[PDB]
Swiss-Prot record, chains A, B, C, D, E:
InterPro entries: GABAA/Glycine_rcpt, Neur_chan_lig-bd, Neur_chan_lig-bd_sf, Neur_channel, Neuro-gated_channel_TM_sf, Neuro_actylchol_rec
Annotated organism of origin: Gloeobacter violaceus (strain ATCC 29082 / PCC 7421)
Chain ranges on the Periplasmic side, renumbered to this chain: 1-189, 241-248
First-listed, main subcellular location of the protein, grouped into a coarse class: membrane
Record's keyword annotation contains Transcription: no
Name recorded for this polypeptide: Proton-gated ion channel
Coiled-coil parts of chain: none
Leftover remarks: The homologous nature of GLIC to eukaryotic nicotinic acetylcholine receptors and other eukaryotic pentameric ligand-gated ion channels, and its sensitivity to general anesthetics, define GLIC as a structural and functional model of signal transduction in the nervous system, also relevant for exploring the molecular basis of anesthetic action.
Protein's cellular compartments: Cell inner membrane
Designated gene of the protein: glvI
GO cellular component terms given for this protein: plasma membrane
Length: 312, 312, 312, 312, 312
């Protein structure tokens, strides 16, 4: 409970490291994630410390009592992290080693503009309660920086884990102490999205395109409208895992293009039937033969252009 | 814990400002929203203060102990805000500067009568626990009024942030102290709603309108009824993000008009087939040619009238 | 903490009033509702009071300390109400005025037998912890009875607010103290339910009824079965806001009648086709012409009878 | 806080009774239920009691302080029950009467093998913290056993309420004290399930069976496959209230039988068309006439056998 | 509160056992599970113990006060377990026996690659707060190891319950104490999944395969596309209980194969109609007769290969 000793007149640089233990519940649509980890705090001090004179009499005279505990808080947590003290340790320089285990919810924005093939970057910020009898500074230990015990996140490939200090810039003077930025880069495992979402949609569209080899108006109308119904049903099927998104997405563009193709093919069928009724068979045949080679080429080209737009 | 000093006999005007840090979870259908922010309290006092005689001996003799803390509460919160003290500061006039970080849920009504192109106004009210040894008054600092650190809300354009005092009017005398009103104006980003909701519905309706170029009764019946089924399915698809609304809405009117158009087109098809069977071909042809130009014009006109009704 | 003074040997009649501030979250299917309100407690006493001798020396010698606080509890709350003391006041008769703000969940049964045009009655019960050194009695102040600050509940018309005392009848002697009954009458705003639920169902049924003007068996079968499919889809669409109900409802009866009508019209179509095949054209024609005028009249009559059954 | 007096060397038999006040939220699929009730504890004692010598001087010298409170806990509650002390009372034999109000969640397994016509049996178990200075025994008072104040549970008929003591059999010696078993028998009100679930399914199946009076292959195929689609849609409609069940159910069997009937009728239609094409009209006609009387009889017989299997 | 006595200089081996009482709420898609159980802690000690000299004077001098309580924590729990002390007991060697009841949520990963016929293995880890005045060691009692009181988990067959110690390997020295691993093996009861999911899908596919016995293009197109729609609807019906899975699954493969078969059968129907129109009847007939025997054989073979891939 004693104040930090200002004998050097130099800011108390504090070195800290967060050690991940288990990361689950990446609720995409909600933009949060559960985190269980080990928070390692270890500060340096000179006065009210002890030089090596105890030696074997007292190899490490540990203090159970809470002394000079640097009050650090997350800035992106609705509710303060869980507290569970594990162990304490002192160095022959008087520097205390503290360990704790906690469970938190962190609010980090997610960007789904390339939903199936996207890479996120989860953020955690650290702030320190700055004292008046001395100046405090947060630093990150390069070792102890953070590791995951070879944990795995379901459907994500963890890529790095990096700490970096940065000014608060919170427009408050006593709130200008530099904050810690814990960056966790992840990449989605996209393989199963192909056979689970992409291929059946193309299958339904290809099934509807068969009407360009048929002359029967009734059969063509049934094909195209029933395939539109199947498309809408399949969209209802796959929206359950798609997060709620008020901006343009790769997959949303693809869906819009598919609706537009359905409209254009109903138009083609109607024009062919009208021309046949008004007795222009050569013209009907030419339009349908043209459509045969024209629909898939234009679908391919539009997809290439969409992909070069969304993926650089 | 001491009482405010009544040496001026003049109400203790208290100046306060809420600083936004992160606003998320605008649950539309629920009419609440999560808020994380910094609450800055700073009152003035004359007695039990200190004039500048300490000077360099004590540039700012800060009081860790809680003195003259004005108990302020939100009036529109189910549960009291989180408490996390950050820092304290004193002025050479004895005026204390207090900062805190909190996380709250605020109950604000939302009006979705122009759902895709609407603008909301989130409200936060402040009340003060009024003491008996002195009179207290809440004021808002024009500076420190509130800022968002350039935060962004997903799918919303933040427009202003304004504080304004107003009488409680809570029909209770000791509850007549003027309250603070924090107004946050937002505007929805409507672009993606167009290709996500509006266009495919029109596409299905236009697809159903093709039956006015066909004579086959069976094909016409399949077209119109299958397109009605597709409309109902698409409504099931898009209701998931539409909030539960017990009043008339722009989009609800549009949906009702589309159901009515489907009914009228089944009627047209039936009348054409009946006239053809009863051998009035000229009349059948005239009705269908009329319908060709009559359905889209009436749809356009009704939409113009609906929009001039809902948007002034 | 002192016991009530038994100097009159007469029960301590306590007068109380609940003042509504904000009522939201009327979760119909769950039969609860959030309530934020002001609870005003004010008891009378003679001993350990003070007559008007202080006068201007002490116009109102208020007691911050908690004295003779009547412990009152709700009986229909899963978890005790929130506590937030606001202010205290004393009368020159020694009678204390207490105010508080709270947030509660109240369990009240809802009766949806006339779902679109129903009127509910939310209930709140008050009980008092009865002491042994004196007798306590709960009364309600006619003024201060309760008001809503002109609050509005979304989709409901608030009608009255009435307090009434009634015996507990809880089969326990020390639990026989009369309880307070706070009754809040509300009426649903039914207008938007018409164009949102009722009309499209009738539209689909009328669309299916067109088969009585057609001779083609294939077209008739498509009409009637596709309209049945559309009915089921629309039911899936509108069940999302309908509360889970294990008893007969007006709307449930209507839905059952519509299923039955669909069955009877498939039967009519089949009988007409069978008679035509077996070469009884006059009889087929007579049955279909009869059905033309017979289906809507019987629908109208059944609806009148259903409504006189459910609405007196 | 004093220990029970061992003057008789005989176990302290404790008599208790739970009085129901409000039972709601029977979440079927979750196998829990909310309970609000009054718990009445009343133990007997001889030493540190008082014989009738006070008389009118002290008709009942009540102890506000907590003395000899038997610590009883539920064994089937995730979280301990709510605590709200109401009143206390002493008998001229020194036996204390205690009352409390609580709100709990009880984990009781539900058996849905006869879902529409099933009867459940909710269970509540009581355990007592057994002391070392004396032996304690839990008994149930036949009067005070428990009543419901004529409460009603929505969609359930409450049948009895019975207490019964039974050995723990928890394989722990200090955990061998006999436990109390509170049994609440309920029966479902099945009437509305008939017109809400059962009849429309039969209506769709009967509608599909009409194809045995038609010769047109196209119309027969449309009838049967569209009715299959309607069946699947109606199943989606009614699964919302059906609890998640990993075992065989009466209704699940019925649904499986209906799918099988649909398969067999597509087979019948295909065989009739094949025989007609291969020019065996007598045989086609004989098969279809046979199917006419064979499908409903076999449906009836299978239903009788299913019901005698599931309902003894 | 006293420190463990270091008179042997030998680590304090502590023996513990978890006794299951009720296991429910195996939320598959969430990878957690509720657990209610009895935790039995019993350590050995020599100093500050008592040899058998009390005898009948004090058969077991029990200590109500908390002495030498080994602080043990779960490592895979978001929030610490519930605490409810039941009883305490001492041995004539001074070894204390402790019992407690708790309610926890345990985070264990689930592997659904063989979803209908899979076997899980729920894990619980134990850690011990290691003290500085002595060395502590966690051991598991072979008896008292854990039992379930013949509890049953709905839809799962409990198979074993085994304890095993293992090094932490948490990369922290003071965190290197060996941890306990409680392994609970379960197997799913798959019977009802057959008639509930597997058979109706095959029924719809077999229904679509009938088009290889028909020549009518319109009827064939209706069969195949309506059966595709029914497949999508049935998938919507059965996804509600299937957990969200970002990897390949047996059932997901089966669904993909069924979509592919639907595509190939639309292709077959189109090619037959094209050849008939272009007047190659022998070739059309040969292709359709080939398809008759070729579709089911290839379905069978692909299923065998899929099953030998997913089940060794
Ligand atoms: C005789 C034949 C008749 C043909 C009739 C054609 C139909 C008429 C209507 C056509 C509508 C065409 C699009 C209308 C505007 C919709 C905009 C749109 O599709 O954009 C979505 C998307 C791209 O979004 P970005 O702008 O890249 O998103 C990032 C920036 N926020 O575009 C597409 O989906 C293109 C599809 C082709
Ligand atoms: C908007 C409402 C859309 C309703 C349906 C519009 C298309 C109906 C089909 C028109 C048709 O068959 O026209 C045949 C017609 C016959 O020509 P003759 O004078 O005989 O030479 O041919 C054409 O017009 C050629 C095709 C071009 C017209 C295509 C129209 C597409 C409309 C898109 C509107 C987008 C909004
Ligand atoms: C031979 C041809 C036969 C034609 C038969 C026509 C169908 C017969 C039935 C027609 C029903 C017409 C509407 C009936 C009442 C429905 C009211 C309605 O639609 O109102 C919704 C809405 C407007 O609501 P407001 O009043 O502006 O909302 C703000 C105030 N609360 O109106 C529309 O949707 C108009 C659509 C045209
Ligand atoms: C309500 C129930 C609605 C069922 C369907 C109603 C419409 C069926 C079609 C009527 C039809 O074909 O009539 C043809 C008939 C033949 O006339 P002749 O005597 O031969 O000269 O022509 C007409 O009646 C002209 C069209 C006007 C009738 C339209 C009726 C619309 C009814 C809307 C009801 C809204 C509620
Ligand atoms: C040749 C033509 C063949 C015709 C065949 C007809 C179909 C045969 C089956 C008919 C079933 C008729 C109803 C069977 C019992 C269903 C009961 C029922 O519908 O009741 C619901 C409801 C009324 O409920 P109440 O009793 O008023 O509710 C309050 C009391 N709890 O009734 C209706 O929906 C009536 C609809 C007409
Ligand atoms: C129950 C299973 C229902 C399957 C379908 C039943 C109805 C099929 C249609 C019967 C049909 O077309 O009968 C024609 C038949 C031909 O008569 P002839 O002997 O030629 O003079 O006419 C009739 O039978 C007249 C109509 C009355 C029969 C209606 C039967 C309705 C059955 C409802 C069952 C409810 C359960
Ligand atoms: C030429 C005509 C071709 C006919 C082809 C017929 C289809 C071939 C496949 C038929 C599958 C028959 C059932 C296969 C096994 C499914 C088991 C099954 O249905 O059981 C469910 C259920 C009964 O479950 P219990 O065993 O009583 O449940 C309590 C014990 N746990 O049975 C039924 O649904 C019977 C339906 C007839
Ligand atoms: C003239 C006839 C025209 C025929 C046209 C055929 C359609 C053309 C497209 C065919 C697509 C074929 C598959 C494409 C890649 C999809 C991959 C795929 O299906 O894999 C899923 C699955 C197996 O996954 P594993 O790799 O075993 O999973 C464990 C390892 N993570 O494979 C299948 O479903 C096989 C189905 C046959
Ligand atoms: C991709 C877009 C798919 C659209 C539909 C493709 C198939 C249409 C049917 C083709 C057809 O009928 O061809 C008949 C044609 C007539 O031959 P002649 O020259 O008369 O001898 O026969 C054939 O081509 C034999 C069948 C082989 C073609 C099958 C094509 C399958 C395409 C799969 C694409 C997968 C992506």
């Amino acid at each position: 409970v004693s104040p930090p000793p200002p004998i050097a007149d130099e800011p108390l640089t504090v070195n800290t490291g967060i050690y991940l233990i288990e990361c689950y519940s990446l609720d995409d649509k909600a933009e949060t994630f559960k985190v269980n980890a080990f928070l390692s705090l270890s500060w340096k001090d000179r006065r009210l410390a002890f030089d090596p004179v105890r030696s074997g009499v007292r190899v490490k005279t540990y203090e159970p009592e809470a002394i000079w505990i640097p009050e650090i808080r997350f800035v992106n947590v609705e509710n303060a992290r869980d507290a569970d003290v594990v162990d304490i340790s002192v160095s022959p320089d008087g520097t205390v080693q503290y360990l704790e285990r906690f469970s938190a919810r962190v609010l980090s924005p997610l960007d789904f503009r390339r939903y199936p093939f996207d890479s996120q970057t989860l953020h955690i910020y650290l702030i320190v309660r700055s004292v008046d009898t001395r100046n405090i500074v947060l630093a990150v230990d390069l070792e102890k920086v953070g590791k995951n015990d070879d944990v795995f996140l379901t459907g994500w490939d963890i890529e790095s884990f990096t700490a970096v200090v940065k000014p608060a810039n919170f427009a408050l003077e006593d709130r200008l102490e530099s904050k810690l930025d814990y960056q966790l880069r992840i990449s989605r495992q996209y393989f199963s999205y192909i056979p689970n979402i992409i291929l059946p949609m193309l299958f339904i569209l290809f099934i509807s395109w068969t009407a360009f080899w048929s002359t029967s108006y009734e059969a063509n109308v049934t094909l195209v409208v029933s395939t539109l119904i199947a498309h809408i049903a399949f969209n209802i099927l796959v929206e359950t895992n798609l997060p709620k998104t008020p901006y343009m997405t790769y997959t949303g563009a693809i869906i819009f293009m598919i609706y537009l193709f359905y409209f254009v093919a109903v138009i083609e069928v109607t024009v062919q039937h009208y021309l046949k009724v008004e007795s222009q068979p050569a013209r009907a045949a030419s339009i349908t033969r043209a459509s045969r080679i024209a629909f898939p080429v234009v679908f391919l080209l539009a997809n290439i252009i969409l992909a070069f737009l969304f993926f650089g």
